[PDB]
Amino acid sequence: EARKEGLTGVEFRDVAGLGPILNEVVEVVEFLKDPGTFSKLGARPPKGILLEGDPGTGKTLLAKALAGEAMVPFYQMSGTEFTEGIVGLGAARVRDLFKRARATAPCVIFVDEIDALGLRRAENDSAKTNEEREQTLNQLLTEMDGFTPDTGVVFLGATNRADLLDPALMRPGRFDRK
Amino acid sequence: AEFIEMYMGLGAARVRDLFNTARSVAPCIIFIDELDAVGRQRQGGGRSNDERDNTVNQLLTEMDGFEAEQQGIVVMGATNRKDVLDAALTRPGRFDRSIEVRRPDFQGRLEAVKVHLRDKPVAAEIDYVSLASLMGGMSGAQIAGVANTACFLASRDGRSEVNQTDLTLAVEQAKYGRRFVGAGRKKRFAVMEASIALAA
Structure with missing residues (x-):
């Protein structure tokens, strides 16, 4: 079972040193609070957002703060969470x-070190270890x-190295922002 | 790909x-x-x-x-x-x-400014030739972006649609972008641009 953090209790005071990022997160939390009015805007919300940068800057400290300021279910767990060795x-x-997210919509789904899922698979290593990572991919x-864009399921993705990215999730509509 | x-x-x-x-x-x-x-x-x-x-x-x-x-x-x-x-x-x-496929011309922008607000709330006091001659050089996606931004600024302002004056600000900040500058470094800027203007 994914750890169901129903109440996260995280606010925007729970973050410090990220002024410029504070204003691109209020858009997401307003969309989370108002899932019905942004469809009236004719605009589409960002389906996925990639937390790129140095480690220790507060990705999940921000993502959990995003979900807390949204007051909406938060779903965080590991990227290798789906890469344990059984096919x-x-x-x-x-x-x-x-589908938990579909049932408790609107929802937040977060995966720290998600690139473990989207590891650009090099041609130097094992093969069946490849079709499982690519299987979850x-x-x-x-x-x-x-x-759907307006299901209220906001996709949170974080990793501390954007160099190992696979081009699949970089496609528009999968990570509309970074 | x-x-x-x-x-x-x-x-x-x-x-x-x-x-x-x-x-x-x-x-x-x-x-x-x-x-x-x-x-x-x-x-x-x-x-x-x-x-x-x-x-x-x-x-x-x-x-x-x-x-x-x-x-x-x-x-x-x-x-x-x-x-x-x-x-x-x-x-x-x-x-x-x-x-x-080039960027929109004067006519292309003239008709893309209105065609992008057919499905957008907007008022009556608008002259599309002004914005057609006012934002020459942007791509069509950028026209969609400036319309999106004007609508969202209306949202953040409490009104539903926008007049001229604020979407003009939206396009100008889409051109020159939106930092703090001290009061001693600001007079240097003032003095040098004033001298360039006086010379020219």
Whole structure:
């Protein structure tokens, strides 16, 4: 079971030193609070947002603060959470998690060090270790590509190295902002 | 980008299956985006030039190929620069017409300013020729962006739509962008720009 942090208790006072980032997060929290009025705007919200930068700057300190200022369910866990060594079950955790989000919409889904999922798979290593990582890759691919913009499921993704990114999630509509 | 794969010999497989489905559902129109990132000129280069090249080869035998045709199917491609692609692709017989998509002109902006607010609330005191001559040089996506930004600033202001005065500010901040400057460094700026103005 993904740790269901129903109440996170995190505010914008829980962050410090990120002034310029404070104003691009109020847009997301306002969309979280008002899922019905942004569809009246004719504009589409950002489906996914990638937390890129140095480690120790407060990605989850910001993401959890985002979900707290939204007062909406928060779903955080690891990127290797779906890469434990048994074939196919990693797809079930993604499926279970995203349909949990579908059932408790609007929702937040966060995956720290998510790049472990979207590791650009080099051609230097094992092969069946590749089809499981890529298996979960295509799993969340289908999951969020079949999603709707206004389901209220905001996709939070964090990793501290943007160099190992796979081009799949960089596509528009999967990470509309960074 | 769907044809970019580091395995051995699947790019040609994807080209082949795409073209076979297109031949089966003929007539058709086959649009390929990101063409500038695969169809660059073949070279020695690195080891990707062993397979990335092979991929392109498949293409060169589908649009012209043997069999003399499939139907006459129309194929189109999105590229930013024609000179980067090799001579085998862009030659006549594989790409006969080459048309260009520039930024919106005065007329293009004149009609894109209104066509982007047909589905947007807006007031009556607007002269579209003013904004058509006021933001020359932006792309159409940027016109969509400035309309989005004016609407959102209205949202943050409490009103639903925008008059001239504030979407003008939105476009001007989309041009020159939106930092603190001290009061001693500010008089230097003032003095030097005033001297340049007085001279000119």
